[PDB]
Amino acid sequence: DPIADMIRSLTALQVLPTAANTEASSHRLGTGVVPALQAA
Amino acid sequence: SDRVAQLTIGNSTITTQEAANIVIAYGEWPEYCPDTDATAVDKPTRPDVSVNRFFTLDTKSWAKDSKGWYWKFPDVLTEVGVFGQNAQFHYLYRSGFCVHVQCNASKFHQGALLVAVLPEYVLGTIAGGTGNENSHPPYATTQPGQVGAVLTHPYVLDAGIPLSQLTVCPHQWINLRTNNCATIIVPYMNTVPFDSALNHCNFGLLVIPVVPLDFNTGATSEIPITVTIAPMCAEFAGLRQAVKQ
Ligand SMILES: [Cl-]
Ligand SMILES: [K+]
Ligand code: NA
Numbered sequence: 268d269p270i271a272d273m274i275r276s277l278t279a280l281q282v283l284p285t286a287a288n289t290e291a292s293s294h295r296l297g298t299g300v301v302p303a304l305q306a307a
Numbered sequence: 308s309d310r311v312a313q314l315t316i317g318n319s320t321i322t323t324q325e326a327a328n329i330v331i332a333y334g335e336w337p338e339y340c341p342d343t344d345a346t347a348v349d350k351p352t353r354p355d356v357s358v359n360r361f362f363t364l365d366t367k368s369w370a371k372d373s374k375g376w377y378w379k380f381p382d383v384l385t386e387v388g389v390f391g392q393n394a395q396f397h398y399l400y401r402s403g404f405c406v407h408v409q410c411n412a413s414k415f416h417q418g419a420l421l422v423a424v425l426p427e428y429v430l431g432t433i434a435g436g437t438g439n440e441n442s443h444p445p446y447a448t449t450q451p452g453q454v455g456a457v458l459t460h461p462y463v464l465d466a467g468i469p470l471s472q473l474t475v476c477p478h479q480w481i482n483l484r485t486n487n488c489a490t491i492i493v494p495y496m497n498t499v500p501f502d503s504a505l506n507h508c509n510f511g512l513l514v515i516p517v518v519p520l521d522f523n524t525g526a527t528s529e530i531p532i533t534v535t536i537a538p539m540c541a542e543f544a545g546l547r548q549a550v551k552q
Binding site (some may be wrong): 283289292 | 318348
């Protein structure tokens with residue numbers, strides 16, 4: 268009280284019995300979005 | 308009203324005034340591959356009318372001594388029209404077929420062709436006659452192209468199996484005194500959802516004269532047999548450059 272200075276994991280488990288599905292997608296043509304580019 | 312018929316698909320139409328119904332192989336209509344069964348993830352191309360239409364191949368001549376012929380699918384069309392082009396440019400292919408075999412004569416001729424579809428028609432050799440030689444059929448025999456090939460031993464279908472039992476497969480007969488064509492609709496059959504149109508022939512079409520052609524001399528002797536086929540629900544995937552084999 269008379270001395271103020273005297274006062275985790277962002278990822279967890281899921282159940283995945285099967286491989287991920289593939290959702291149908293179409294063409295995407297635009298600026299700003301660029302999922303193919305990465306920074307290893 | 309069962310003897311008359313018309314088949315229209317794509318920019319092509321077939322007519323017949325002496326049919327004997329139509330066979331739907333194993334009772335199933337061809338259909339595009341459903342998402343539950345599919346495995347390849349790329350969106351396929353389904354050209355529709357440019358490939359699901361009737362193609363007429365080279366005609367054969369039926370003689371009093373013919374042994375019989377056969378064609379392999381999809382081999383017959385790998386180099387015809389837009390269908391062939393798609394089969395060459397893609398790794399994966401899948402489709403069904405409408406097979407229409409034609410042969411007309413006169414009310415004075417006689418004979419009977421058995422028209423059948425045999426899935427996975429694997430051929431064998433006569434093993435050097437004695438059976439001590441483990442020979443194999445050459446490409447030209449297993450995949451004869453659009454010209455088809457001739458059976459050397461129809462009785463055993465060049466494969467050690469009895470012609471007498473071929474009727475256990477989807478078929479029709481062209482009995483000259485009754486009809487002049489056979490029509491069979493074939494659905495895709497394989498252990499995989501799509502496959503190579505070049506390396507694997509899904510089925511073979513056999514046309515064998517079980518009751519030999521005959522007629523009195525003076526009657527027309529050139530009695531041809533013509534095969535017209537149409538891919539149905541043709542789908543392709545795994546696009547890349549064109550490959551012929
Ligand atoms: Cl024989
Ligand atoms: K899943
Ligand atoms: Na990104």
